[PDB]
Amino acid sequence: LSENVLFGMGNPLLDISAVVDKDFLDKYSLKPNDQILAEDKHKELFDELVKKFKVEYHAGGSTQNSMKVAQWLIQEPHKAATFFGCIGIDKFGEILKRKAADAHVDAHYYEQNEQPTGTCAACITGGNRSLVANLAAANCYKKEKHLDLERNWVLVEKARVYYIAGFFLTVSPESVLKVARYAAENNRVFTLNLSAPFISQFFKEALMDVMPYVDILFGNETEAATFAREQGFETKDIKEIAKKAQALPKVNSKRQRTVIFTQGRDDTIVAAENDVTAFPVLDQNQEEIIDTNGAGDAFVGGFLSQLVSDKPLTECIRAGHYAASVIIRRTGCTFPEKPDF
Ligand SMILES: Nc1ncnc2c1ncn2[C@@H]1O[C@H](COP(=O)(O)OP(=O)(O)O)[C@@H](O)[C@H]1O
Ligand SMILES: Nc1ncnc2c1ncn2[C@@H]1O[C@H](CO)[C@@H](O)[C@H]1O
Ligand SMILES: [Cl-]
Ligand SMILES: [K+]
Ligand SMILES: [Mg+2]
Ligand SMILES: [Mg+2]
């Protein structure tokens, strides 16, 4: 593989992670398994987390996590995976830079000095993770001042595979579209996550603007169900949702869309190759689970590590299941130094 063969961009966040209780979730009107954007009522949540819960700080952000997981499984060369996004000039920013370097990703941040680096409260209860994202600097990403510069754009031009989490549609749909159109015009593979229910609910115009450029769509079962509802697809069958998403208007007709929905411990659903297939999750030992935060990002990273080396679908899924199995045994979207795949 070459350097910069995989490209992502997104919201670089520092995760502030801790095991909480139902009470804590309930006083902040938080679902046990959800992802939301921070509101004013959530400023006290972050303070309370750090004062009374056993917080760990780990690099996060959905696309950043998948770029790191991908790199991890690739191993060599270093800098196979590129990541762009915006941070502040602060301690949390410095942490994110260090962890990107440690992960051997080619990270190029837009740094600005007004907003702090973005953070995400990762509130863990049993097999559940409730995420509250305070994007801050991540929301200040400027296409015209970063992606569009030739010294950055050349890295985009080096990639065979692109991945952007749907989360980034809340920040820069224009960036997403520029990369997607580039991918389509060059018959490269562009990939995207549904990310969270709120993306289908509140950012559906931007989502449906990018959808025609999507060669592989990722998501979980709850995200799929929401996307279906918000498109008027009524079905009691996740396989049908994946088929319907597969058949959406597509600009690059030379590649068929592939749609892949994970379902936690239930089977991963893949619409591809004129069929829909369920791939079981063979790792079912619930007693070893530490924290499911990052499971789906690790699944994507695992999948992408194999995709860039032209591996078969089965092996792509296998690597995504393996990476998720490692990540759910640790705090945050973290991993040991080496894979065992
Ligand atoms: N409780 C679990 N038991 C075993 N594997 C799990 C569990 N939760 C997640 N995983 C693994 O992580 C993958 C993605 O998890 P999922 O919960 O669907 O995604 P997300 O993190 O996007 O909500 C699953 O396909 C599976 O490989
Ligand atoms: N709005 C968001 N944008 C980008 N990443 C997010 C957002 N909300 C949560 N995440 C990330 O999702 C990861 C878990 O999938 C966490 O590491 C967290 O940082
Ligand atoms: Cl992201
Ligand atoms: K985890
Ligand atoms: Mg889960
Ligand atoms: Mg997810």
Curated annotation (Swiss-Prot):
Binding site residues for Mg(2+) 1: 29
Sorted UniProt keywords: ATP-binding, Cytoplasm, Kinase, Magnesium, Metal-binding, Nucleotide-binding, Nucleus, Phosphoprotein, Purine salvage, Transferase
A GO cellular-component term linked to this record: plasma membrane
Residues annotated for adenosine binding in this entry: 15, 286
Cofactor binding: number and manner: Binds 3 Mg(2+) ions per subunit.
Pathway: Purine metabolism; AMP biosynthesis via salvage pathway; AMP from adenosine: step 1/1
Cofactor(s) needed by this chain: Mg(2+)
Effect seen on changing residue 66 to A: No effect on in vitro phosphorylation by PKC
Active site: 297, 297 (proton acceptor)
Signal peptide (UniProt feature, chain positions): none
Assigned EC number: 2.7.1.20
Classification via InterPro entries: Adenokinase (IPR001805), Carboh/pur_kinase_PfkB_CS (IPR002173), PfkB_dom (IPR011611), Ribokinase-like (IPR029056)
Summary of activators and inhibitors of this protein: Activity is inhibited by 5-iodotubercidin and 5'-amino-5'-deoxyadenosine.
Tissue specificity annotation: Widely expressed. Highly expressed in liver, testis, kidney and spleen (at protein level). In brain, expression in most forebrain structures and the cerebellum is higher than in the midbrain and brainstem (at protein level).
Quaternary structure, from the entry: Monomer.
Family: Belongs to the carbohydrate kinase PfkB family.
Function: Catalyzes the phosphorylation of the purine nucleoside adenosine at the 5' position in an ATP-dependent manner. Serves as a potential regulator of concentrations of extracellular adenosine and intracellular adenine nucleotides.
Protein's name according to its UniProt entry: Adenosine kinase
Species assigned in the record: Mus musculus (Mouse)
